[PDB]
Amino acid sequence: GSSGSSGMATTKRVLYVGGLAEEVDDKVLHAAFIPFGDITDIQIPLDYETEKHRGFAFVEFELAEDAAAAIDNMNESELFGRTIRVNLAKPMRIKESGPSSG
Template sequence: MSIYIGNLSYEATQEEITQVFAEYGTVKRVQLPTDRETGRPRGFGFVEMSTDAEEEAAIEALDGAEWMGRDLKVNKAKPREDRSSGGSWGGNRGGGGGNFSRRY
């Protein structure tokens, strides 16, 4: 399980986030996704801690806390959705069969 951190400052580093979360237990990993085109931080991240109890303590303490001029959104990370199935332009196209040249 991991923790989602939203509304992060774009200047926040992995080391700074590790220090903040280390107050609540052992930080196993910090991940800060970057934009593919610009390489800049995307304003959110993920933290993995050693135990569920440590994660719960960090979420309880840090959700809504002000850090680096922003109010953090901290909660349990949701599993990544499978983007290849259903919906939009790939995967299961439903009744249309992918014929996009129809005129309406």
């Protein structure tokens, strides 16, 4: 049994981790997800003024299957004495400001 609502895509490698701690970083997440498979790259949400994170990040998996397995597990897992959430990366959405109809 299976089905695709969202649509058609193969971007099931980048996982979204939430509920992270103030000490958790790309490094902590790496050695924390290194078991599942072989992380290809990691991204951390930071600013240009403070360059700090709110409590989440995005991890990539060498494969898709490995990622799915990481979610089913890491999902509502226990990290640093906290409950983090894991799920497929949400669909981004950007825009551009410009003059219209004049």
